[PDB]
């Protein structure tokens, strides 16, 4: 039926937990999840807006990995 695959929205709470665990965090406030989602969105928006723009100047509708690499290099941090 794939009700799951169809209804998934944004990144999951256990992903956030895995991320915080990787960054060495021990306990999190409940408000962290929402905050993190917000932070991610802004990040992606900033990279993709650039990537997309690069793509426009390449005269294509397909975004390559090099477009993303250049986009990230614009925001710095890192490759």
């Amino acid at each position: 039926r794939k009700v799951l695959r169809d209804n998934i929205q944004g990144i999951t709470k256990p992903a956030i937990r895995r991320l915080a665990r990787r960054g060495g965090v021990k306990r999190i406030s409940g408000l962290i999840y929402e905050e993190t989602r917000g932070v991610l969105k802004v990040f992606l928006e900033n990279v993709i807006r650039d990537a997309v723009t690069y793509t426009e100047h390449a005269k294509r509708k397909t975004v390559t990995a090099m477009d993303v690499v250049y986009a990230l290099k614009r925001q710095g941090r890192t490759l």
Binding site: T12, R18, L19, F43
Partner: protein
Amino acid sequence: TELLIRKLPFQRLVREIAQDFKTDLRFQSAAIGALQEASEAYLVGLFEDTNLCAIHAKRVTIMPKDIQLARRIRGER
């Protein structure tokens, strides 16, 4: 270990965000991957910084103000 963000939800998120910029966009698999690697690195580093803030405040539990302080100092907004 070794999983962080799940592939499909992330893909969906990227496509949904990219809509508002340009309609009928297409991504190479390598490009979605690149964004996922970058995003994971970003968030993990940010949690390291967030944690430094919480420790500075004598807390084990990180909080939104920890993230906010970290991003403030890094100059993000």
